[PDB]
Amino acid sequence: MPHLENVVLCRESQVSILQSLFGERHHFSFPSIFIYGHTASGKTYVTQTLLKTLELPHVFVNCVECFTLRLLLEQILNKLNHLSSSEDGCSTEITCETFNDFVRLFKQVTTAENLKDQTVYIVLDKAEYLRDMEANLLPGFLRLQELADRNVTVLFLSEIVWEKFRPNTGCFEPFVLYFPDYSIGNLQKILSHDHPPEYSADFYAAYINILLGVFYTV
Amino acid sequence: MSSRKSKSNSLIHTECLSQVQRILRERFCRQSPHSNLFGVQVQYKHLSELLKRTALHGESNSVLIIGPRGSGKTMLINHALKELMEIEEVSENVLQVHLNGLLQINDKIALKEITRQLNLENVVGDKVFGSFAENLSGDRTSSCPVIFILDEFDLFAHHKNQTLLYNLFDISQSAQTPIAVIGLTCRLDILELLEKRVKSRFSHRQIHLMNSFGFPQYVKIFKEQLSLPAEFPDKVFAEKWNENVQYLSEDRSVQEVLQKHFNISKNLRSLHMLLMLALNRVTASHPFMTAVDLMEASQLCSMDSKANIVHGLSVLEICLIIAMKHLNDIYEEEPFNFQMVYNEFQKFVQRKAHSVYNFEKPVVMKAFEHLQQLELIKPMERTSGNSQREYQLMKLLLDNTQIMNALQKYPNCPTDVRQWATSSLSWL
């Protein structure tokens, strides 16, 4: 509430869409949800708040910090064993590098009662640098529901549009969601909500309107 | 005695829809036994006569199934394997290895992950690194023959002479226990994609599982996916579900959406998104269906994704994409760098009164750099590392059609800017 809707007052048509895809714990969804936005900050700040509100199992990894496929699949399990069960797994590491063994070791972790019939969210931050490596890791997440056979929903928060990472042999076609742009009538209210306690509401909002008309063109 | 059943009925309505979401979503991607055949009755008899030659006897057959992907090709092979489960005198002696060509990319890794499915001589641990040499191959053994299943003949199809497929083609032609192989692939012709040493050693049997529907028989597919079996606790709510679909199947607005997606892609996967999006709108206040929840779900997945990205921009980058549009009319297909755009930037400043609209200079490169992270320009073939802010020779990634139709829908369009975009620059 303080950071889910007050940040952008133009998401009234998007809250009912994401909550409809969640449902309950035993409800499933598509194995990959591609959501591209602008500025690479509007869709990221809303993700850290909506997931921390309903208390759901989710992780956050990045593809830019690691340039190899061995380190990308390792950081996912490092942030999974801490919340796989009710207690810690004695802080044990995982030694793997084969891409085929990723779907085998992930099933053993998602066996406890915490991740048995629950929805797991995989948020891939900055999903626009995957084409630099190999052309085989792209359809891996599109068909993860058939291989892993687990309630895993992979999220995408990239700046590039969807029709730019098409492989040579094709892949699964999921749902492409596009968030509405920053409206002129709603951007004025979100920039005046964070008012300091030294002023008020009408006295502080007057200093914002005088700067919006001169900075909208630039 | 009345304020009890009415309140309890509302709780059932909120829980009955939860049992449907866990079935429809588990039917598109995940293969469910509720989905029957779709005009493939003649192809079902062909694959049934070949599987019984191996399980009941010892004749292995290798065919090629060509179709879409995991939503259409997985409606006949997995159904034939599950048919063997009803007869328990063979299902317990025949195992199954689940392989996928999308995961394997080489040949050395495939020699180690194959033992993870049989587990007849090792443990969680994997034996010596030795490449397999004796893969166990009087034609009657008691070691439980296992049938392998492959998928996606495209990744390993261009490796090194395909040293993995030649082993499976020799076990059925060896001397111990014949082992068959049934795989899935999306590419049409696969036979010629191999060498002559593998081409002459194949069954040359393939079936093209391509749908050939139209419009009258296409409505039955839309109603079959929404026909849930007799699994609801109350049979009264199950009768109104199938009847409500018939009232919406013959409509002037519902039939128009079905024919629009059928011409673009007649595959069953293209219709999966047209049935689950309408279910998301049905919450705790939708007792029935209508022709409104199905039209709004088909428009958001078909809009021009290359024309709506210009609405959330200012005036700087908007004037840039129009600047290169005017240069394309005078330069017939030839690259050009960014310094040519700066020549016309100080040209539009004229014929205008002295105000505060004039800029400086570093704002021009900052406005053009915003399009670099959006991938709106593409180099000829090489991106120079030592190139500065003058040598780019970039082009455009749009067209001369959607740029003109995206002007009347843009919010807040100035009068002195829209006239410059429509004209071909006739003034100074």
UniProtKB/Swiss-Prot annotation, chain A:
Chief location: nucleus
GO MF entries: ATP binding; DNA replication origin binding; nucleotide binding
GO cellular component terms, A-Z: chromatin; chromosome, telomeric region; cytosol; nuclear origin of replication recognition complex; nucleoplasm; nucleus; origin recognition complex
Signal peptide: none
Main function: Component of the origin recognition complex (ORC) that binds origins of replication. DNA-binding is ATP-dependent. The specific DNA sequences that define origins of replication have not been identified yet. ORC is required to assemble the pre-replication complex necessary to initiate DNA replication.
Subunit structure, interactors included: Component of ORC, a complex composed of at least 6 subunits: ORC1, ORC2, ORC3, ORC4, ORC5 and ORC6. ORC is regulated in a cell-cycle dependent manner. It is sequentially assembled at the exit from anaphase of mitosis and disassembled as cells enter S phase.
Similarity comment text for this entry: Belongs to the ORC5 family.
Gene that encodes the chain: ORC5
Post-translational note: Multi-mono-ubiquitinated by OBI1; ubiquitination is important for efficient DNA replication origin site activation. Ubiquitination levels are low in mitotic and early G1-phAse cells and are induced in late G1-/early S-phase, peaking in S-phase and decrease toward the end of the cell cycle.
GO terms, biological process: DNA replication; DNA replication initiation; regulation of DNA replication
Source organism (scientific name): Homo sapiens (Human)
Location of this chain's protein in the cell: Nucleus; Chromosome
Residues of the full protein shown: 1 to 218 of 435
Keywords attached to this entry: ATP-binding, Chromosome, DNA replication, Nucleotide-binding, Nucleus, Ubl conjugation
Binding residue positions for ATP: G37, H38, T39, A40, S41, G42, K43, T44
Protein's name in the database: Origin recognition complex subunit 5
Tissue-specificity statement: Abundant in spleen, ovary, prostate, testis, and colon mucosa.
UniProtKB/Swiss-Prot annotation, chain B:
GO molecular function: ATP binding; ATP hydrolysis activity; DNA replication origin binding; nucleotide binding
Chain coiled-coil ranges: none
GO biological process: DNA replication initiation; polar body extrusion after meiotic divisions; protein polymerization
Residues the record lists as binding ATP: G67, P68, R69, G70, S71, G72, K73, T74
Subcellular compartments: Nucleus
CDD domains registered for this protein in UniProt: AAA (cd00009)
Keyword tags: ATP-binding, Disease variant, DNA replication, DNA-binding, Dwarfism, Methylation, Nucleotide-binding, Nucleus
GO cellular component, one term: nucleoplasm
Residue numbers of N6-methyllysine PTMs: K7
Domain of life according to the entry: Eukaryota
Known partners and oligomeric status: Component of ORC, a complex composed of at least 6 subunits: ORC1, ORC2, ORC3, ORC4, ORC5 and ORC6. ORC is regulated in a cell-cycle dependent manner. It is sequentially assembled at the exit from anaphase of mitosis and disassembled as cells enter S phase. Interacts with DBF4. Interacts with POLQ.
Disease named in the record: Meier-Gorlin syndrome 2: A syndrome characterized by bilateral microtia, aplasia/hypoplasia of the patellae, and severe intrauterine and postnatal growth retardation with short stature and poor weight gain. Additional clinical findings include anomalies of cranial sutures, microcephaly, apparently low-set and simple ears, microstomia, full lips, highly arched or cleft palate, micrognathia, genitourinary tract anomalies, and various skeletal anomalies.
Family the entry assigns: Belongs to the ORC4 family.
Main function: Component of the origin recognition complex (ORC) that binds origins of replication. DNA-binding is ATP-dependent. The specific DNA sequences that define origins of replication have not been identified yet. ORC is required to assemble the pre-replication complex necessary to initiate DNA replication. Binds histone H3 and H4 trimethylation marks H3K9me3, H3K27me3 and H4K20me3.
Protein name: Origin recognition complex subunit 4
Source lineage: Eukaryota, Metazoa, Chordata, Craniata, Vertebrata
